[PDB]
Design a protein around this nucleic acid. Structure first.
Lengths: 93, 50, 55, 94, 97
RNA sequence: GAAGACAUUGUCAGGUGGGGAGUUUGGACAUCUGUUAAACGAUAACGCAGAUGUCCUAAGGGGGGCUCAUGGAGAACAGAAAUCUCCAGUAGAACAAAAGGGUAAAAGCCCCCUUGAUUUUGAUUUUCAGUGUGAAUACAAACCAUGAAAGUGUGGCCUAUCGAUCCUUUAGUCCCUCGGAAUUUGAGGCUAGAGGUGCCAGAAAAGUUACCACAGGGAUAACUGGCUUGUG
RNA sequence: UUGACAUUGUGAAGAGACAUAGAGGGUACCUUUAUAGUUUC
RNA sequence: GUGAUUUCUGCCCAGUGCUCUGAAUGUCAAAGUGAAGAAAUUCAACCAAGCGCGGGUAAACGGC
RNA sequence: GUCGAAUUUGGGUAUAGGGGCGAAAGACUAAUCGAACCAUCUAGUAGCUGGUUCCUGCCGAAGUUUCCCUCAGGAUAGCAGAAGCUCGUAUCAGUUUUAUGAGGUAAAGCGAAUCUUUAAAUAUGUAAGAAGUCCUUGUUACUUAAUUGAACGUGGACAUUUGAAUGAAGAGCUUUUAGUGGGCCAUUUUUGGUAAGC
RNA sequence: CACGGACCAAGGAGUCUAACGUCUAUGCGAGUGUUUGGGUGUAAAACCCAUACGCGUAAUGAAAGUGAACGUAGGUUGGGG
């Protein structure tokens, strides 16, 4: 068989090996505990909407979007600027 | 090849004019008012080798 | 530059390697006879070292 | 060899096939035996192939006698004809 | 050589499919048409510095071309090409032997 | 003072341009007949005597007729030297050409009709890796030519006469695509040919160095196997 | 080294064309003419 | 380039390289102009220098 | 050799690598010049040379084919090892015998032609049965005037002298990869050459 | 009479990686692959897991496209058991 390897360039300079895979995970769970004491009563992430995905291959599913709208926040009975302080993401676009 | 002789003149490295002993630049008098509307009288003081 | 090329000269006037604006086309075979007799390791010209058939 | 196709993206060509051999693996095991012990046009088990992740229904082997409602985007000639032998329809969902 | 102006050979135009009367012509190459695919790739590649990039063929040895001879039908007007061998003098029609 | 909407400067375009830059500057090669070649085939040498890069709407097909090279005996002109005529004539003639086969109610010479030198794609033979290119042979499906008929014809009586990739171009279909959706130009595709690489399984290419540089090869003459002497 | 474009403006004459400004004139026509204009060498 | 002095340097402008107070419609880029078309685009006519043609030159390469 | 000048020389200063400077040798430019020295790109590339580190056991080669700007090298085939798989007497063989083919060489012949009328020895093709023979009649869109035939069958009949000799550390099949692709000598035959360790 | 070797000690030459082919061992088997990431911890170990995704279960076309039972998935021949 013919096989295509792309190694003519000086590739030995740019090689990154991830020995810190078990290191950075331990250094990431210490961020989710330091944030959880600074944000002390609050649930560490905002509330996300419900969105149906594009691109015919994936439109059968449903997916967590980015923010609600200016319209869904109005129909629930609260303003947009007050919604972001309560903990609710609002997407204007 | 290398740079031929006449291409090497215009750098002025060792080809500059020898000028230690020259008396000065032999120019006419600067055209002022008196030389443009009359004459002026001058004395020759010494004539000298340059 | 654009005029003094081999492709653009022959169109003006109307194949052996080394034909130029100079000597000719026939002189190149002639002036290469001074280096003609050499054997390349193909024996040399005019020494074939072979027996012909003389009938 | 052929014509060139600029900006190809395999999301316009997602269509995995599904032979009529399988056609009952989409129903789980504990529900699988119950609809086989019913030839009822009253209760046909609805099969939604798109939720399982299958684009087109092709007819390869032979299915049992039980009538089945099949929902799919694309079916072929012998695949649709074989289900009507079992007394089942094909609802073209999009 | 010398070929006749008229020639009765097999046709295929969804109606004839038989030996019908044809008229003879000689094949000539078409216009260069510089908006083709090969010319536009060749023009973009020569643009810039670097000089000549494609090979330019020099060493010619043949003296003849093959006579290509396409035949126009007179009923269905379907044209069909046909070849001959290499020849030097190719006239057609007149001068019966 | 001079000069003036020109010069100058900016950007593209043609001409010139070893003063300068980069690089290159091949090793009976593709073929057919005879022979070397030693009773299957294959078999070398810068073995050998010779051919080819064409030619022909007939010098391709089919059917009918007929016998050639050459000699003997004869006809005003006319003889050894045209035409006439008979006797013998296994081919001693001829077939586009080298050469070897094959050929007599023919494959030759004369007349009659013609396009099978066509369309569709497979099987097989030769060089052979049983790849390609070339050339060839036998079938099937058509559609034809010819002959009273059987049959014969998929070019030349058999062996030599030739060309991939990318690109260009025509023919085929009247089809497929231009990816937000259509129309009309345009472009790209599938099928089958052409334009050519003679270093012919296919690079685009001039010299010199004794001023020379480098990686490597190869020498040593004079014992063939009685090898040399005085008589063409 | 040669051409084009840019830098690059303003005049007076000359040769045209239009826009306008009336007269005539056999929706118009078209020989005429004035001017205040925009441009072509 | 030639190489003191004395003495002498003859012929050829065809090629080659220069040269020009020559010639003029042979080739001839970009830009611009005209025509066709729905347009991209295409064919035209025109077109500076050079080249081509004509003239000069050998104490220019040279051929004597 | 030259020795009052185109002389010799100190210090200052100017020109720096495709550059300088040269009364011209391709000279000189820090013991380096037909293109200085320093460090980096750099462990540049080599189809060329040299080297390649422990023992025993088993099997064991090639210098040849076709293609290549190929001739100190590659790709392909051949030869070689390893892994094994399906089976188990089996189809066989660098060999003879019986039968039957094809050859045109040595000899013979010129009272054959002008280069074969005749024809060996040695080498070579194919057979020696079960996938066979025989009988009867089934299928078909082919074939024939015709079920006539071709081809394949149903069924029935014939065993180990079942169709010559000798032999057979099994026979068949498939992957996979190494090295090699510079050869040389002798008998016999022969070419080229006077002959040659040609 | 081709090249290297005065002698001794110590150094001294088929290595690592990405994508694969044949073969062999192991897990599961119409499926398989936990480790990008989350949970957890005696803390770069171990153990646990979601949705996806990669290869496989369908090919053939340049493409628009289409997409596998006449029959116990067939008939004949040779077949281990």
């Amino acid at each position: 068989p013919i096989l295509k390897n792309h190694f003519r360039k000086h590739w030995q300079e740019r090689v990154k090996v991830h020995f810190d895979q078990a290191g950075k995970k331990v250094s990431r769970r210490n961020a989710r505990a330091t944030r959880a004491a600074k944000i002390a009563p609050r649930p560490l992430d905002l509330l996300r909407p419900v969105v149906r995905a594009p691109t015919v291959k994936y439109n059968r599913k449903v997916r967590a979007g980015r923010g609600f709208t200016l319209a869904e926040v109005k129909a629930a009975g609260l303003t947009a600027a007050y919604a972001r302080t309560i903990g609710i993401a609002v997407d204007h676009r | 090849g290398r740079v031929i002789r006449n291409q090497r003149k215009g750098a002025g490295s060792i080809f500059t004019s020898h000028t230690r002993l020259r008396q000065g630049a032999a120019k006419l008098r600067t055209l002022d008012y008196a030389e443009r509307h009359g004459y002026i009288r001058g004395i020759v003081k010494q004539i000298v080798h340059d | 530059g654009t005029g003094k090329k081999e492709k653009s000269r022959r169109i003006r006037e109307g194949r052996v390697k080394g034909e130029n604006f100079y000597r000719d086309s026939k002189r190149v075979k002639f002036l290469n006879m001074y280096t003609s007799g050499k054997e390349i390791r193909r024996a040399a010209s005019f020494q074939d070292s072979t027996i012909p058939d003389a009938r | 060899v052929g014509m060139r196709y600029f900006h190809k993206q395999q999301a316009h060509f997602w269509k995995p096939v599904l032979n009529l051999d399988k056609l009952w693996t989409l129903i789980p095991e504990d529900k699988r035996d119950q609809y086989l012990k019913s030839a009822s046009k009253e209760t046909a088990p609805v099969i939604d192939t798109l939720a399982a992740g299958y684009g087109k229904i092709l007819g390869k082997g032979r299915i049992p006698n039980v009538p089945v409602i099949v929902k799919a985007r694309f079916v072929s000639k012998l695949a649709e004809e074989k289900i009507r032998a079992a007394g089942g329809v094909v609802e073209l969902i999009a | 050589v010398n070929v006749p102006k008229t020639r009765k050979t097999y046709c295929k135009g969804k109606t004839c499919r038989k030996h019908t009367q044809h008229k003879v012509t000689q094949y000539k190459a078409g216009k260069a048409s510089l908006f083709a695919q090969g010319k536009r790739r060749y023009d973009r590649k020569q643009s810039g510095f670097g000089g000549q990039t494609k090979p330019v063929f020099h060493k010619k040895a043949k003296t003849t071309k093959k006579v290509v001879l396409r035949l126009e039908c007179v009923k269905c007007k379907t044209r069909a090409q046909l070849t001959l061998k290499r020849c030097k003098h190719f006239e057609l029609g007149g001068e019966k032997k």
